[PDB]
Amino acid sequence: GTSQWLRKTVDSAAVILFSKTTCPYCKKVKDVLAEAKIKHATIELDQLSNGSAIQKCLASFSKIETVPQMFVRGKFIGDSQTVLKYYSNDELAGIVNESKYDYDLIVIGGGSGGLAAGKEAAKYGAKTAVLDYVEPTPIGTTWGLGGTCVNVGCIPKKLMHQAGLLSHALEDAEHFGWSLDRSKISHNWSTMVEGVQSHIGSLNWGYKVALRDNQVTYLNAKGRLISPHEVQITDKNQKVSTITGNKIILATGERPKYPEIPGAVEYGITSDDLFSLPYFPGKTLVIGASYVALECAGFLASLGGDVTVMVRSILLRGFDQQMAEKVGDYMENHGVKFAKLCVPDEIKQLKVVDTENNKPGLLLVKGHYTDGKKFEEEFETVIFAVGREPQLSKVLCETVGVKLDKNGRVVCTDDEQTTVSNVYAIGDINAGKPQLTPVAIQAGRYLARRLFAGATELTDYSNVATTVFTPLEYGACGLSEEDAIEKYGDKDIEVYHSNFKPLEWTVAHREDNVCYMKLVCRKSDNMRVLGLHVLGPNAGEITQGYAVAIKMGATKADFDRTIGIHPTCSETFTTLHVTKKSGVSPIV
Amino acid sequence: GTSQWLRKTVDSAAVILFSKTTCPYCKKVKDVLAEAKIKHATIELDQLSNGSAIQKCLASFSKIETVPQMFVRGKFIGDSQTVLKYYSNDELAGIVNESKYDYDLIVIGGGSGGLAAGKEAAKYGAKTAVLDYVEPTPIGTTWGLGGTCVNVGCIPKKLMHQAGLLSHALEDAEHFGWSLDRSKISHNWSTMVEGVQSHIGSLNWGYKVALRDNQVTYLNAKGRLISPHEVQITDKNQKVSTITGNKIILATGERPKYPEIPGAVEYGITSDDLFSLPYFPGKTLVIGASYVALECAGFLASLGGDVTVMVRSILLRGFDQQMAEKVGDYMENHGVKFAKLCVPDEIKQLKVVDTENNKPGLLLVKGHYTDGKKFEEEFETVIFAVGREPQLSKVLCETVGVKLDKNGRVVCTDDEQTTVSNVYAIGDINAGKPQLTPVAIQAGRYLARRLFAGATELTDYSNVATTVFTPLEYGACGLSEEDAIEKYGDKDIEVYHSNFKPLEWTVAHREDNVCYMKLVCRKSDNMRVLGLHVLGPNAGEITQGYAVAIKMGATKADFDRTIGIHPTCSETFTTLHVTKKSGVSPIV
Numbered sequence A, B: 001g002t003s004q005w006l007r008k009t010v011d012s013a014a015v016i017l018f019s020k021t022t023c024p025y026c027k028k029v030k031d032v033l034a035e036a037k038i039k040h041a042t043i044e045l046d047q048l049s050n051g052s053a054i055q056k057c058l059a060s061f062s063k064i065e066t067v068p069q070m071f072v073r074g075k076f077i078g079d080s081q082t083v084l085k086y087y088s089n090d091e092l093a094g095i096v097n098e099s100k101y102d103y104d105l106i107v108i109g110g111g112s113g114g115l116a117a118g119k120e121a122a123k124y125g126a127k128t129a130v131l132d133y134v135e136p137t138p139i140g141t142t143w144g145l146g147g148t149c150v151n152v153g154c155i156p157k158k159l160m161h162q163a164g165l166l167s168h169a170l171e172d173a174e175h176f177g178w179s180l181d182r183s184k185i186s187h188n189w190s191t192m193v194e195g196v197q198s199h200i201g202s203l204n205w206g207y208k209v210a211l212r213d214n215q216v217t218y219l220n221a222k223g224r225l226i227s228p229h230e231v232q233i234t235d236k237n238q239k240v241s242t243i244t245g246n247k248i249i250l251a252t253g254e255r256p257k258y259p260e261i262p263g264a265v266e267y268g269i270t271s272d273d274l275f276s277l278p279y280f281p282g283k284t285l286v287i288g289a290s291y292v293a294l295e296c297a298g299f300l301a302s303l304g305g306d307v308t309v310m311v312r313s314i315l316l317r318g319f320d321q322q323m324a325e326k327v328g329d330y331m332e333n334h335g336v337k338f339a340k341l342c343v344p345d346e347i348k349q350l351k352v353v354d355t356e357n358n359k360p361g362l363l364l365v366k367g368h369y370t371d372g373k374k375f376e377e378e379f380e381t382v383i384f385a386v387g388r389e390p391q392l393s394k395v396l397c398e399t400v401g402v403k404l405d406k407n408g409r410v411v412c413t414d415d416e417q418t419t420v421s422n423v424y425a426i427g428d429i430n431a432g433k434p435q436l437t438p439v440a441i442q443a444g445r446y447l448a449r450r451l452f453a454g455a456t457e458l459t460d461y462s463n464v465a466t467t468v469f470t471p472l473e474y475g476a477c478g479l480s481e482e483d484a485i486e487k488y489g490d491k492d493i494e495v496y497h498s499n500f501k502p503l504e505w506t507v508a509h510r511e512d513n514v515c516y517m518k519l520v521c522r523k524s525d526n527m528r529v530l531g532l533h534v535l536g537p538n539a540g541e542i543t544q545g546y547a548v549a550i551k552m553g554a555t556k557a558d559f560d561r562t563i564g565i566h567p568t569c570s571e572t573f574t575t576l577h578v579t580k581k582s583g584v585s586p587i588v
């Protein structure tokens, strides 16, 4: 396998030095390169068990077996004496810059994955371009560099969640002795949005600076891959041109879906619009039951809004349904109305949005329930959160040969390679993978290392933890209870569970026996923890550390032998004892 | 080892049934016992690899090898037919109640460990008494059942911490759009104390009910162990009597120390008094530098108080000193004054505490700095937080033979046994162990199971995680950096670290590059994580889950291959890359 790896590494790396840590000829080359500001990968063969075998395989490229050996874009460039020859003759810059292509790497999409991949690639001397373009929403909303999470996803969503959480902090403060009267305090949407947008602006600008400082070319243009190595770019002046790249990373992400009903595109909005909305949404209908729908409904209600969620069938399909029900029950008990078993038929406009005074319009929503009753109610804002979809029609001519699945996502090997061998896909468009920002970042950084620094490590997509930032947060890692029972059978599954009450909730007069956690375990495999689930405050902070233990194969006994930190919510995971099979109540 | 275990189990258990899950004679006995409300341990021999060997050893006690076999206090009582004979002749109740001693277990001390041990023992039929008495503080403060954590420790301390955190939540709320004016809001100490005390009262009462419901005798009396099995009790009427017990658990905890300077006992207070203080402390001096001192100083300052901490030498001796400095620096930058390298000489009274109007008195504190300058300043309240000490002189006549160490703590084996073989010690008085509430609870529950249900599992006291609930919280699990370098040498230690900024702090205009985390790893052992350290919000929730992974032997690679949850503080542990040896700045 050593020779397979070395061939792939030499072919792909942009600038790479084979070295040993204790070799002064190697250091001589390193210092010349550093002085010339020539970035490169380095592989220290004295730190690899098969280092000696690697030296022998190198002769198949260089005709020599010694270190250092320098390669550029698949070609042996020289040992120490040859590199210094090139340097002293001012030939080195031209050598390391010579390529069949404009770039070693073109990233199509400047989001979580694409920026992470581009930045990491540049570190190893890959001449990199990042293309990003934000197609405006139907009402004209656009935003800057950084992708969905940064501009219209995880970042503003969690900031507006925090704004919502502060509502309950204001309420709690009275019970803890502060002289506040919560009932006399109101929230100003536009003040919040301005703060959120100023932070997002600092991230847009930070990315542009980061790319400039790492010698990455940022093009604000739409890229279309028209052949394996050619990207056609359309700038914002509609000027069309072609750039070429050795490796291509597709990292274009997804956009919200609209249902095909009259009025939806014209008068509704999506999460793309919400996070910079220049007017307060007012009385709001969220159509959908995804984590986006419930997160958005949740903070709008905590900010004091009149909020309704229209649910076709179930909440959070694909998540543990016991937990999803507890999530929704909390929301319903804390202001959020649910129109259950209900779908929309038509959105009619009653008032146009007030651009001058930053006030919402007014809409009539007509729909129907499964029981035959009609739904007809007025809302100032209607948000569709009914799924997201890739957009690759607009980014690959189908003649390039990149295989998509029936949903339009890219079919990849376990090292992110598409059916076109120099083209890779990462992030939400990679079929079958968890659609999460840290997944995209790890995928892109690890891919860049394999392409340009000879790394072999793959991204592990199993047991990736998640958190839904609903008013009461839901963190999870591993299998839902129903999926575990489906895979292994009910007789091989034991579930330990407990309610709990945050200490913070006692003086504040909040609920007993609402926060809840469970471990779904496999009896025949030493009570291996297959899935962990927690409903409670700070659920992402709670869950994260356990994901390391679950990756390592934690069992129930590993949890039991660990000592809790007191007083915390998380410590209840270390003393669980009630099983579901026992029928004993989990209340405390 | 099987026969050693069985002898110890039979001798110690109060009521125990040797059984098999699939034996209807065993079930016959179980149902009789359950109907008679006779609580017992059960050991199902068909679930132990050495079950068959256990059956053979039982003959050494019972002259039989079959199941079921019932034992009471070291004596074989019968098989199924004999047990039902006793039942039908109404002899069973007297059989299972016969003992040389009044109780199978006497717990001296009704705190975290003692209540946990007593409750768990009762579950297996041990006739149990829990003794608790709260010696009043010098000003007369007393409290109810539950120990230090519940009444004057972890519980009220974290509630008052929450009250302090809400100060910053009120400030943040304005930036997130709420119409509050933080500058016009004040805090009312006594309203907070009343809420805290109402919660503590619910815990005092909850424990009394829990004990009653588990048939545990609660005696509000001071116990003195006068021989191995005799406890002399003095009730609150000063009536003296003697009760006897088979096993004795010492769980009496510690109390605050006072320095031997004029005025300290008369005019200062400790944490014992603070948490129910009927008057607001006002301008406060905390003498000390323990986690108690800094936690108390911290919330008093966040509540708006004028607070000074007098530090003899360093903060948080025994904790990682880089982290301790960062903890103190945050406090100093957020209101807390520090009188460094300073000790007190005298406390003089200037005003007596106002019992009618619930106002503090006034004190003059005289002290001196190491540089020879005098300290002389007035404070309304002076809190000593200069360590805690066991009190066992008042609980064991020294003739019983329980060995204490030079600090007065009980010298125990790894199964909590003292030098008197029926007497055990748990919690803070157990020499050498981490002095934490979940440690005491695990120790007591696991000990009760070994004593009365034949368990073998010991408490693991290694890598016990902690959190200091200072204004910016500090969570830790494992070795400090300096202890790791001392044990293994600097060349075998690699430290990965990073600053971070909570997303919640961006819109709120709080600090960059103040929150901080590090992993202290051992190079020669696959980069094993020896210690984890985090300064940031919710640090106990962050740290807890990682303690499971560290117990399992997590390496840096285990952290790296785990995917972060975004956006959280904790996820930064999954992408650390800057080493201290590299000299690269950890700022982000």
Ligand SMILES: Cc1cc2nc3c(=O)[nH]c(=O)nc-3n(C[C@H](O)[C@H](O)[C@H](O)COP(=O)(O)OP(=O)(O)OC[C@H]3O[C@@H](n4cnc5c(N)ncnc54)[C@H](O)[C@@H]3O)c2cc1C
Pocket (backbone or CB within 6 Å): A108, A109, A110, A111, A112, A113, A114, A131, A132, A133, A134, A135, A146, A147, A148, A149, A150, A152, A153, A154, A155, A157, A158, A221, A222, A223, A224, A251, A252, A253, A254, A271, A292, A391, A394, A395, A426, A427, A428, A429, A435, A436, A437, A438, A440, A469, B565, B566, B567
């Ligand atoms: C409301 C919402 C909340 C979310 N909350 C979380 C959360 O809390 N935690 C979490 O982990 N994940 C969250 N996500 C998911 C997270 O945003 C995505 O998983 C992540 O952004 C995906 O990154 P990506 O690189 O795959 O694509 P994206 O970040 O979407 O970036 C793709 C970029 O490429 C652009 N582009 C598309 N086509 C082209 C083209 N031809 N040429 C040039 N540029 C193009 C796109 O406009 C975009 O800028 C949330 C998503 C949403 C919608």
Ligand SMILES: Cc1cc2nc3c(=O)[nH]c(=O)nc-3n(C[C@H](O)[C@H](O)[C@H](O)COP(=O)(O)OP(=O)(O)OC[C@H]3O[C@@H](n4cnc5c(N)ncnc54)[C@H](O)[C@@H]3O)c2cc1C
Pocket (backbone or CB within 6 Å): A565, A566, A567, B108, B109, B110, B111, B112, B113, B114, B131, B132, B133, B134, B135, B146, B147, B148, B149, B150, B152, B153, B154, B155, B157, B158, B221, B222, B223, B224, B251, B252, B253, B254, B271, B292, B391, B394, B395, B426, B427, B428, B429, B435, B436, B437, B438, B440, B469
């Ligand atoms: C200010 C403060 C804050 C703390 N914060 C935390 C935290 O956040 N997390 C954490 O894990 N730990 C915390 N601790 C430590 C925690 O309180 C102790 O580790 C825990 O309470 C120890 O339990 P214990 O069973 O050993 O003794 P204790 O809980 O102290 O109980 C001993 C009981 O026995 C009584 N007693 C003593 N002698 C006798 C006698 N002869 N007869 C009858 N009764 C007697 C005592 O009055 C007491 O009621 C804190 C401690 C303090 C002082």
Ligand SMILES: NCCCCN1CCN(CCO)CC1
Pocket (backbone or CB within 6 Å): A317, A318, A319, A320, A464, A466, A476, A477, A478, A479, A480, A531
């Ligand atoms: N947009 C699709 C959402 C469903 C994705 N689910 C995958 C498995 N994870 C693991 C936690 O149990 C739960 C969420």
Ligand SMILES: NCCCCN1CCN(CCO)CC1
Pocket (backbone or CB within 6 Å): B317, B318, B319, B320, B464, B466, B476, B477, B478, B479, B480, B531
């Ligand atoms: N009252 C004594 C306080 C010192 C106790 N220390 C022990 C080791 N733990 C592990 C975390 O590194 C830190 C705290």
